[model samples]
Target: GAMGKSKSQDKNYVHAREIDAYWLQRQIGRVYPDAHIQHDKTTSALKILSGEPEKQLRDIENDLMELFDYEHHELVQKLIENRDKVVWLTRLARAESREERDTIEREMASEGLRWILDELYG
Candidate 1:
């Protein structure tokens, strides 16, 4: 009877650790905030049916500003919202020349907001 706890017991412990939903939920609040999660989800649902990309982004801007009450509509929102994380992201979107710079920045703003917008849109 020298059969100590077998590999099955070790696997059980591993599975239990992995399935800890309470632990996962605890981590969610730290890494993610759900302030406007519902709003983003609602908007994303309707965004798919929309056609015009020009007016589409403008609507996103207006809606986004409403979510946080931020001042500027462009990079200012991303910059103000994320502050540090999107600072480089904002700069990266602006590296090009002034001619197409606005377009590039606007697209990047959409991409950047995905951190909050698209993440919750899931």
Candidate 2:
């Protein structure tokens, strides 16, 4: 006779609360004394990151650190690295026209995302 058990059955997952943008912005300003409050430009940059049209996700990393307050510096660093990669890739993608914007969404559907998740949790 044999018995099979599911360990995940006993696991409890708690979802974190979403931090309000206003509070997050204030926290960033407090934490990083030199942080800039370019609200309009920052909003536009974030829109670009969210795959919005009419603008490219450029020059947002430095602002992101301030926006998120670097709560998770390692993850933030990884994202920044990926962003830099995309920046270069965008240039290469349209080498003929010398365009520095990606026409297609940057594909992050690789083991890289999982690796970072493991690094964060495991």
Candidate 3:
């Protein structure tokens, strides 16, 4: 008779564990204030704080800053909003390699990243 328990038998334990893990965080006020819970089928489920963001991007900034993925016209819109940073971030984002980029466009991608990081971190 050691065949043991079934999936149904494990249901309550699983639900309780989920409650312990997730429901606990839904506390009255304790918070992961900066975190974003994303359950989208296409993307990630949770987002780690990327820190503060550019005013123009204060609300949209996240792990995938426009600096990395821009397919949603994120970059285009940012370019229009922060044109000055656009020239810098565009050169930084599109650079084939920092070495070649330096030899070609002579753009300081590192310094540009610094500015973007500053926008998000400061």
With a 3 Å backbone cut-off (N, CA, C), the pairs that clash in candidate 3 are none
For residue 49, what is the lDDT in candidate 3?
19
Tens digits of lDDT, candidate 2, 1-122: 13336344322221111222342234234444554554443343344344434333444554555555546554344444454233323333334542322222223214133333333235
- In the range 1-120, model 1's lDDT, one tens digit per residue, is 336554343321222112222322222233335745643532442342132354564565565455434533443243233332333233333357775655644664665544432232
Sorted on lDDT, best first, the list reads 1, 2, 3
Q: What's the lDDT of the predicted structure labeled candidate 3?
A: 0.33
Please provide TM-scores, in order, for all candidate models, with all chains considered together: 0.20, 0.25, 0.22
lDDT tens string, model 3, 37-87?
322311221121112233334443443344234443433243234433433
Q: Rate the local accuracy (lDDT) of all candidates.
A: 0.38, 0.38, 0.33
Whichever of 1 and 2 has more TM-score, that candidate is: 2
Clashing pairs in 2: none
On a 0 to 100 scale, what is the lDDT of residue 82 in model 2?
Answer: 50
User: Model 1 residue 77 lDDT?
Assistant: 40
